[PDB]
Design a protein around this ligand. Structure first.
Ligand SMILES: Nc1ncnc2c1ncn2[C@@H]1O[C@H](COP(=O)(O)OP(=O)(O)OP(=O)(O)O)[C@@H](O)[C@H]1O
Ligand SMILES: Nc1ncnc2c1ncn2[C@@H]1O[C@H](COP(=O)(O)OP(=O)(O)OP(=O)(O)O)[C@@H](O)[C@H]1O
Lengths: 235, 235
C-alpha cells in the first residue's frame, strides 16, 4: 500500500511498532536484498563504536539488507551511501546536513544522524538513525528542531529510500562516484583530532580514492585514516 | 515510521511492491500474531470461491495472521471480522457498504471488497481485498468510483487496521458480538439462490448463532447454509 517505485532498496519493507535493534534483526533474519527494516523505536540500538544510541518514537530508525557484488576494496564505501543519502534527503527539506567522516551527518556541528554498517560475508546491513521529531541527547539535533516544526516521518522515509536506491544502483555500476558526492558534502578544511591507538591532530584535507581521511599534521606529515575503530573529534 | 497504535493487529507489517499472494506468504511464513502482510499488487490473487481475484495497483491487498485462543466453534466467525472491519472503514469514508453473506461487501449491490480466510496449522490467515483506486472488473466498484476521486491508500490501510484490531480484541473476549454487527450490516429480507447440488432458493431471513444463513423456501421449509464453499446469488 506504500506504492514504492524503487528498483532494489524498498522492494520489501518490514515495519515494527517496536524492536530491539533493526540492525540485529536484519543481520539475523533470512531477508532478500533491498529489504528495509524500520521501527517506530528501538529499545537496544547501538552506534558504530558499539555505544548506546537513543531511538525514541519520532525518529527514523531503519536498516537495509544489501549484497553488493563489488570488489572487496569498495566495500568500505557502503557507509558513505548512507551518509550521502541522508544529506540529500535533508537538502530536500532545506536542512544543511554535512558529513563528519566517516559515518555522521551534522547540522551546525550537531549530530542529526548516524550510519552503521555491519556485514558477515556476503550480507551487508546498512543501518541509519535519523532524528526527525524525536527528543535528542545534548549536542545532537533533529529535523524538527532545525525547521522549528514537525516533519511528516513517512515523507522523510519515502525521500530517503528513493535517494538510497538511486545511489546504490549507481554504486554497483560506478563504485567511485560516491566519493565525489561525499567530498562535496563533507566537513573539511578544519582541525580535527584522531582518536585510535593514542591520537594525533591536524587538518582534515580530504578523502582519498579509498575513502580514507587525509590529515595534515602541523609537522607537515600526512596520515591516511582508514575507517574502523577510530574516533574523530573537531577542535 | 508508520506509528501504528494498535494492540495486536499491526504490531508488525510486511510490505511488498509485488507478491504472488499475501495469504500464501502468510500461510507459509513463521509470523507472530497480528502481523500484517500487504502488497501494492498480487500476481496470483484468488477468492473465497477460488476465482482469480484481480489485485492491480491502487487497491488494498492484505492478509493478517491470527491465532485466536477461542473455542473451536467460534473459529469460523473470523471472516465476519474482516467483513465488518471493511464496512466500518467504508462508513468512515462516507460509503455505505453492505455485507453479502458470508464474505463480501457491496455498495449498491456492486462488489467493493472480498474476504478470504484460510487456516494453515493452528494459525488463521485473514485475507482482505478492497478496491480503492484500482481499476475493477465490470459490475464491481471501488472507493474511488463511489467517491469520484482518488483516495489516500495509506489512509484506508490505517483505518481498516484500527477497526480490525478493535474488533479482534473484543472477539477474543466476547466472540458472539460480531454476529450482531454482521446482522445489522448484512443484506437480508431478499430472495437468494444457493448454487451447486441440491440447489434451492428462498428468502435470506437472518444468520443464526453459528453464522449460518437461514433461508425460508417457498414451501415453508427452513434450511441453514454453512459458510464453506457456498456459492450464492441474489434474485
Ligand atoms: N539520537 C541520537 N542522536 C544523536 N546522537 C546520539 C543519539 N543517541 C545517541 N547519540 C550519541 O551518538 C553516539 C552514537 O554512536 P557512536 O558513538 O558509535 O557514534 P560515532 O560517530 O562513531 O562517535 P561520536 O558520537 O563520538 O561522534 C553515542 O555514543 C551517543 O553519544
Ligand atoms: N478486485 C476485485 N473487485 C471486485 N470483484 C472482483 C475483484 N477481483 C475479482 N472479482 C470478481 O468477484 C468475484 C467474487 O468473489 P469470489 O471469486 O471469491 O467467488 P464468487 O462465487 O464469484 O463470490 P460472489 O457470490 O460473492 O460473487 C470473483 O469470482 C471475480 O469475478
Amino acid at each position: 500500500m506504500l506504492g514504492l517505485k524503487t528498483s532494489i532498496i524498498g522492494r520489501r519493507v518490514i515495519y515494527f511498532q517496536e524492536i530491539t535493534s533493526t540492525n540485529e534483526f536484519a543481520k539475523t533474519s533470512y531477508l532478500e536484498e533491498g529489504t528495509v527494516i524500520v521501527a517506530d523505536k528501538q529499545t537496544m540500538g547501538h552506534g558504530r563504536l558499539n555505544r548506546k544510541w537513543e531511538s525514541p518514537e519520532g525518529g527514523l530508525w531503519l536498516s537495509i539488507v544489501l549484497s553488493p557484488k563489488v570488489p572487496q576494496k569498495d566495500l568500505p564505501k557502503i557507509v558513505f551511501l548512507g551518509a550521502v543519502g541522508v544529506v540529500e534527503t535533508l537538502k530536500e527539506f532545506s536542512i544543511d546536513g554535512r558529513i563528519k567522516w566517516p559515518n555522521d551527518v551534522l547540522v551546525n556541528y550537531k549530530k542529526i544522524a548516524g550510519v552503521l554498517v555491519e556485514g558477515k560475508g556476503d550480507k551487508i546491513v546498512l543501518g541509519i538513525g535519523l532524528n526527525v521529531n524525536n527528543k535528542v541527547p545534548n549536542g545532537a539535533t533533529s529535523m524538527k528542531l532545525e525547521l522549528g516544526s514537525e516533519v511528516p516521518l513517512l515523507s522523510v522515509f519515502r525521500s530517503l529510500i528513493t535517494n538510497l536506491d538511486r545511489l546504490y544502483l549507481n554504486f554497483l555500476k560506478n563504485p567511485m562516484d560516491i566519493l565525489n558526492l561525499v567530498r562535496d558534502n563533507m566537513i573539511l578544511g578544519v582541525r580535527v583530532k584522531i582518536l585510535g591507538d593514542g591520537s594525533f591532530e591536524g587538518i582534515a584535507e580530504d578523502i582519498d580514492d579509498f575513502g580514507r581521511l587525509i590529515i595534515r599534521l602541523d609537522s607537515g606529515e600526512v596520515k591516511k585514516v582508514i575507517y574502523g575503530d577510530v574516533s574523530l573529534r573537531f577542535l
